[PDB]
Design a binder for this molecule. Structure first.
Ligand code: HEM
Ligand SMILES: CC(=O)N1CCN(c2ccc(OC[C@H]3CO[C@](Cn4ccnc4)(c4ccc(Cl)cc4Cl)O3)cc2)CC1
Length: 390
C-alpha cells in the first residue's frame, strides 16, 4: 500500500488530485514518514498527514508546527532570502498579517465587486450558445486576475502584459520584468498613496525590531506570489465548480432555481475543489501527532485535499452535494494563517455563478478536462464546454 506510493511523484497528480491514493493513506497511516525518493524536494523525508483531525491539529498549533520551512518565474537569485507572510511565525507574522488585513478596505472591495460584475456579464454575453469554448482560457482565468490586479493597484493597461510574465517568455526575463515593474509600482505608491492593498503594505514602517515591515525585495515577492497563486487558486475553484455542477445536472437545476442556495453551494465547491490541497510546516520541538512521535526540525506536509474528503467528518465524502451541512472544510485553511482572500474568492464564485446560471441551465463538458501537473495546486488548464439556456 503506502510503501509503494510516492506523493512527491508529480505523475500521480497530472490527472487531478489522486483521491484514491489518499483513501489508502487515511486508512493505512494518518500520519506517515514518507521517505525521500528521486522526486522528493531536497532529498528530505517528511511526515505526511492525510486525515482531517490531525491536519486541523497541525494547523491550529503554530508554535509546535512552524510555518518557517518558489516556482514559476519568481526571481531565484535575489541577494537576500526574503520572507512571505505565509512563511512567517510570530512575532513578525502577526504584525504583517494585521497590516495586510488593513489593506483590504471596503472601498477597494467595492471596486473589485463592481468590476467583477461588469466583466462577468461582458464575458457571458459574448458566449455563443452551444458552441464549444475553453472556459478556463476565456473566462475563469480572467476574472480573478483582474481582481488580484485591483487589490495590488495595477493599472488596467498593464494587467495582461504582467499576467504573461507570471504565467508564460523565459524564466529570467519574466522575473526581471516583474521585479522592475513591482519596484516602480511600489515607488509610485510611496510618492502618491492609492486605495489598494499594496499601497497600504508598502507605505508601512514598523518600530518593533523583531517585526519589521516588508523590505522592498519582500514586497516584490509578495506581489509576484500573490498575483500568481491568488489568481490560480481562485480560477481553479471557478473551473472546478463548473465541472462539478456539469457532472451533477440535477443540482445545477436546483441551484439555478434558487440563488439563496448559493452560499452553501460555494462552501461545497471550495471543499470539493480544494485548490490549495497541501501545506508545509516544520516541527519546532518533540511532539506526538495521532500517536506518532515527531522530532524537532522534521518536515511535516498536511493535505487539506485529503482532509476535506475524510469520511470521519464528511458523510458521503466522495460525493458533491450543494446542500452539504455541516461543512467544516479546510479549503481556506484554519488558525492564524487562515486565507485572507476567503471572502474575495467567494465573491468571485458568487458573481460568476449568478451570472452564468441566470443565463445558462445547460452545461456540457465536451472534452476531458486537462489538469495541471502539481501537488501544490489542484487545477484545470483546459475545460471545453458548451453553454445553452436549457
Ligand atoms: C479559492 C481561492 C483560494 C484558496 C483555496 C486559498 C487557500 C488558502 C489557504 C489554504 C491558506 C492557508 C495557508 C497556510 O496555512 O499555510 C491561504 C492563505 C492566504 N491566502 Fe488564500 N486562498 C484563495 C484565494 C486567495 C486570494 C484571492 C487572496 C487575496 C487576498 C488570498 C490571500 C491569502 C493570503 C495573504 C494568505 C496567507 C495568510 C497568512 O499566512 O497569514 N487567497 N489561502
Ligand atoms: C514534497 C511535497 O509533498 N510537496 C512539496 C511542497 N508543497 C507545497 C509547497 C508550497 C505551498 O504553498 C502554499 C501557501 C503558499 O501558497 C499559498 C497559495 N495561496 C495564495 C493565496 N491563497 C493561497 C500562498 C499564500 C499566501 C501568499 Cl502571500 C502566497 C502564497 Cl503562494 O498558500 C504548498 C505546498 C506540498 C507538496
Amino acid at each position: 500500500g503506502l510503501s509503494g506510493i510516492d506523493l512527491t511523484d508529480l505523475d500521480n497528480f497530472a490527472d487531478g488530485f489522486p483521491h484514491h491514493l489518499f483513501a489508502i493513506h487515511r486508512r493505512e497511516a494518518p500520519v506517515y514518514w514518507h521517505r525521500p525518493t528521486e522526486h522528493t524536494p531536497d532529498g528530505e523525508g517528511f511526515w505526511s498527514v492525510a486525515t482531517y483531525a490531525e491536519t486541523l491539529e497541525v494547523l491550529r498549533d503554530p508554535v509546535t508546527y512552524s510555518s518557517v520551512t518558489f516556482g514559476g518565474t519568481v526571481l531565484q537569485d535575489l541577494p537576500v532570502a526574503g520572507q512571505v507572510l505565509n512563511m512567517m511565525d510570530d512575532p513578525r507574522h502577526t504584525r504583517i498579517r494585521r497590516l495586510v488585513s488593513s489593506g483590504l478596505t471596503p472601498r477597494m472591495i467595492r471596486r473589485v465587486e463592481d468590476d467583477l460584475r461588469r466583466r462577468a456579464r461582458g464575458l457571458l454575453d459574448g458566449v455563443e450558445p452551444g458552441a464549444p469554448f475553453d472556459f478556463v482560457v476565456e473566462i475563469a482565468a480572467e476574472l480573478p486576475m483582474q481582481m488580484i490586479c485591483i487589490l495590488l493597484g495595477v493599472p488596467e493597461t498593464d494587467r495582461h502584459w504582467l499576467f504573461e510574465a507570471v504565467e508564460p517568455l523565459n524564466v529570467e526575463d519574466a522575473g526581471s520584468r516583474l521585479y522592475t515593474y513591482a519596484l516602480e509600482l511600489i515607488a509610485g505608491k510611496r510618492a502618491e498613496p492609492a486605495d489598494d492593498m499594496l499601497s497600504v503594505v508598502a507605505n508601512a514602517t514598523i518600530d518593533d525590531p523583531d517585526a519589521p515591515a516588508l523590505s522592498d525585495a519582500e514586497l516584490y515577492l509578495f506581489f509576484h506570489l500573490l498575483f500568481s497563486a491568488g489568481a490560480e487558486t481562485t480560477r481553479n475553484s471557478i473551473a472546478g465548480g463548473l465541472l462539478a455542477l456539469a457532472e451533477n445536472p440535477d443540482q445545477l437545476q436546483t441551484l439555478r432555481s434558487d440563488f439563496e442556495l448559493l452560499p452553501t453551494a460555494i462552501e461545497e465547491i471550495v471543499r470539493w475543489t480544494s485548490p490549495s490541497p497541501s501545506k508545509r510546516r516544520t516541527a519546532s520541538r518533540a511532539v506526538s501527532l495521532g500517536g506518532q512521535p515527531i522530532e524537532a526540525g522534521q518536515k511535516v506536509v498536511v493535505w487539506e485535499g485529503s482532509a476535506n474528503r475524510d469520511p470521519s467528518v464528511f458523510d458521503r465524502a466522495d460525493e458533491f452535494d450543494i446542500t452539504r451541512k455541516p461543512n467544516p472544510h479546510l479549503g481556506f485553511g484554519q488558525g492564524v494563517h487562515y486565507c485572507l482572500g476567503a471572502n474575495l474568492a467567494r465573491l468571485e464564485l458568487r458573481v460568476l455563478f449568478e451570472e452564468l446560471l441566470s443565463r445558462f441551465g445547460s452545461v456540457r463538458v465536451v472534452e476531458p478536462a486537462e489538469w495541471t501537473r502539481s501537488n501544490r495546486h489542484t487545477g484545470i488548464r483546459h475545460l471545453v464546454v458548451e453553454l445553452r439556456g436549457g
